[PDB]
Amino acid sequence: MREVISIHVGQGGIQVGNACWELFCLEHGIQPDGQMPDAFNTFFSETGAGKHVPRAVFLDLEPTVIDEVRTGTYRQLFHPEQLISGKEDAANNFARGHYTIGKEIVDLCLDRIRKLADNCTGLQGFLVFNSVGGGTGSGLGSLLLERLSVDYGKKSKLGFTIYPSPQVSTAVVEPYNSILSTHSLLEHTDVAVMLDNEAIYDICRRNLDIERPTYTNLNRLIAQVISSLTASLRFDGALNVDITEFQTNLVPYPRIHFMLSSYAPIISAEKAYHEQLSVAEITNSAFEPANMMAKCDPRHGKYMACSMMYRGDVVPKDVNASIATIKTKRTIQFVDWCPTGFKVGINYQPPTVVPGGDLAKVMRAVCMISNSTAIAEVFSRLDHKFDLMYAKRAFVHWYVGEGMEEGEFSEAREDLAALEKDYEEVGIET
């Protein structure tokens, strides 16, 4: 009687949704056709006899990815008319997907959301995935969040956004729409998790020893993180954690809800079994700055609160004996007004392996969600990138001619300045 609905918008969102939906189907024993040859209820729904239907909706204005989905092996799984598709792409223009073509599509998506919500009885909250540096992704994510915040109100929404890397970039105009989308979801989303690609590339290179990774390898790690986060809702555990038990433990103030994640262990089968993978060493590896899932240095800032999930055969006393060691270290310092900052969850189900993938099978794993003061650097560098081109008003004509006003750029800049001032004000000791 506990449910959650995941929203996938944009090319990156759909490509990570595919990645998480192989993993969930594999973890619950459901074949790609949707047929089994009481834990499924969190992500799926029973049709009365036979197949299961995911509680997910796919959105995009550009039809190529959806058409690829509707012809692959998973054509029989998803309901045919929840893969909403458009005709014309926003083409990396934020104003397009927020004012011009997204408005005519958003009504169908909201109707689908209502039709899925009326089925659930114990709706925990929503999940949303969107790559920020794109037109349709950021614009439609903003519009959907704004509609949901007023249609439903206090229901919790979680956002797994992928911000651009510090120096590596695929587009040339992504700072503009990244800043605008951060403006939009700052006052509209309860949790936002950092996911830039460069850090995960470094993780793959160093640990998985892959020298030529593709997007699928990144999306599989993200899917594993999602599964670790939501395992506690569908498996028995000695110390459970619910989604609604987050803003009471990781969010000191309503404005501050951007945090960065990490995962451990990450190791290949060729050298995994030569070492014992004790809980102490994995919880040490999870706190290593080089294993952050976002390219930010935690040594440059304080910690505010750490929520970290275990799964497997871990015993609570071993967890406490390792939290003490971390509190001992002099290179990791917490904020003054937080004496204890750890929330611990323990689950029994070990992580599942996907055949043909990178990760091996292990009995212990740890996933941490940590809120730290050091996150302000990404905001500062994105702001610096934005200012350089906004000084000469470059690329603005592509946005003014799509219905957006001239002054809309300035207030996003003011909100980022306010956020940066707030992060500095919080981190000073009393």
Partner: protein, 160 residues
């Protein structure tokens, strides 16, 4: 806007520093971007010698020979390899003391001031005109009308 006398000088010195930091021939394969960012903010011995050579200081006397500069560099450099902006300023002051060492009647402050006049640091255009590369093209496998064509467009001007 304006800058302080040591800093205007400091602003011009920072401009020279940032220019010579980018001239480094980095040896190695598959760097991290953190290392590239670090190397853009530090000067190595070769780029420091290039600076002294372009400003006509290197090998001018026995106290500023390639070996003497190498010893001075290893003694005052960060990690014995690199100069940041502050260590670069200290190294220029040490080079000024060495370069004018035979002038016994000059204070160390007057030796540094005399070096800053010698490099013309107070004139940004003359100071910048002494900046020279090492090497780059923009990757393009290279090899009667070559002489340049300044297409002076006809002013469709106020009178025209």
């Amino acid at each position: 806007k304006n800058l302080t006398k040591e800093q205007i000088r400091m602003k011009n010195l920072k401009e020279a520093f940032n220019f010579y930091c980018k001239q480094q021939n980095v040896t190695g394969v598959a760097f991290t971007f953190d290392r590239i960012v670090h190397e853009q903010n530090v000067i190595n011995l070769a780029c420091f010698m290039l600076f002294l050579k372009q400003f006509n200081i290197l090998n001018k006397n026995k106290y500023v020979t390639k070996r003497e500069i190498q010893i001075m560099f290893k003694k005052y450099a960060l990690n014995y390899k690199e100069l940041d902006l502050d260590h670069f300023k200290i190294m220029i002051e040490k080079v000024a003391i060495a370069f004018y060492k035979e002038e016994e009647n000059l204070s160390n402050i007057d030796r540094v001031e005399k070096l800053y006049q010698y490099i013309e640091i107070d004139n940004i255009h003359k100071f910048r005109s002494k900046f020279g590369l090492l090497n780059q093209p923009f990757n393009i496998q290279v090899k009667p009308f070559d002489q340049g064509r300044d297409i002076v467009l006809k002013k469709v001007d106020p009178v025209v």
